[PDB]
Design a binder for this molecule. Structure first.
Ligand SMILES: O=[N+]([O-])c1ccc(NS(=O)(=O)c2ccc(Br)s2)cc1
Length: 358
């Protein structure tokens, strides 16, 4: 019944192979998408190393520049790029065709990522630094890496809005299993907590009855105990707030997907919904407040290896290994009809409408 309406809208935005991108470079090590504004691909044509920048507001005319770097990450908001070659890092102002700042590390940077409009996070074998793109400041060590991540492939680093809660995520192969290892660091308490988790995000959420927002930490994992999603308040609640009750729910995998697991998460600020993407290309939607599973479906035939918030829709945008750039967001006119008549959850239908953010 009502099978024709979904609580989501799926969109295809681009096919990178139609823009002259070699499929061999559509992957984690060579393609970055730090926000929904740009995609950056490192390619080698002949023996000329090149960087291709796709402006998502003008994607038919990508810029191909012969530059040699081990990694390239566009700023989330500005026409600014960070480039790395060996231990040397440089940030460039593209519009002004000028170098902004540079720094030479002592230890190799194995993973890096913009965490804000002006700060890039650097991960070495044993520590995590934050580096502002402004002024003269060098990178600042934020914390030392926990031993539980030793030997992991680092796959993500992200923070809460106030950059007081920092999360490093790695994976490792244990026999034929992919095991997630996370390090949650409190800047104020100077304490680390190891967590078995595969994908995660932070969110700000205003509880009914509270005047101030709660800082939530959501992570998903598939371990020996199966698929689980947790939603937790981190830190001391703002003065006057009631604490957010911890939520824990199952993450479902069908019998033919015993080897699937979570790989990406983004949270809608507007709709208080968690988007979870699995290795096999499934998307799940969960209510942030309760963890209720709203929707699941396989939306990609190829693995989606990078995601970002999709600002205009408060959704999630991602690139899959074939070069499809795709997004999922809440369908604002159909989600409450779906919850009412397919999920048959009038509590959630009511709570959603009361939030009145559709
Ligand atoms: O902003 N750019 O697109 C842009 C900025 C600087 C250059 N110079 S470079 O020698 O190729 C260079 C490569 C790696 C580092 Br690290 S510096 C080229 C392009």
């Amino acid at each position: 019944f009502m099978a024709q309406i979904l609580p989501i809208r799926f969109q295809e935005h681009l096919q990178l192979q139609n823009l002259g991108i070699n499929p061999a470079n559509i992957g984690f090590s060579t393609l970055t998408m730090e926000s929904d504004k740009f995609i950056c691909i490192r390619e080698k044509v002949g023996e000329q190393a090149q960087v291709v920048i796709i402006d998502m507001n003008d994607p038919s005319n990508p810029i191909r520049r012969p530059i040699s770097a081990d990694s390239a990450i566009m700023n989330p908001a500005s026409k600014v790029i960070a480039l790395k070659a060996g231990k040397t890092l440089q940030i460039f102002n593209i519009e002004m065709k000028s170098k902004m700042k540079a720094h030479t590390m002592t230890d190799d940077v194995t993973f890096w990522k913009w965490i804000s409009l002006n700060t890039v996070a650097l991960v070495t074998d044993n520590a995590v630094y934050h580096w502002s793109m402004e002024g003269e400041s060098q990178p600042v060590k934020m914390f030392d890496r926990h031993s539980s991540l030793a030997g992991c492939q680092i796959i993500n680093y992200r923070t809460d809005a106030k950059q007081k809660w920092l999360l490093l995520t790695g994976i490792s192969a244990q026999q034929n299993r992919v095991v997630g290892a996370m390090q949650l660091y409190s800047v104020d308490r100077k304490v680390s907590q190891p967590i078995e988790g595969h994908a995660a995000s932070f969110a700000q959420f205003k509880m009914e009855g509270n005047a101030e927002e709660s800082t939530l930490f959501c992570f998903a994992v598939r371990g020996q105990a199966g698929g689980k999603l947790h939603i937790i308040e981190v830190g001391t609640p703002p003065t006057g707030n009631q604490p957010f009750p911890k939520k824990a729910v199952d993450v479902f995998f069908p019998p033919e997907a015993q080897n699937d697991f979570p790989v990406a998460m983004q949270i809608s600020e507007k709709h208080d919904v968690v988007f979870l993407i699995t290795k096999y290309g499934y998307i799940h939607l969960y209510d942030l407040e309760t963890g209720t599973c709203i929707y699941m479906n396989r939306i990609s035939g190829e693995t989606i290896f990078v995601t970002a918030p999709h600002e205009a829709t408060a959704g999630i945008i991602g690139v899959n290994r074939k070069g499809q750039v795709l997004s999922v967001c809440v369908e604002e006119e159909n989600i409450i009809p779906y919850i009412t008549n397919v999920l048959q959850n009038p509590d959630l239908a009511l709570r959603m409408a009361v939030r009145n953010n559709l």
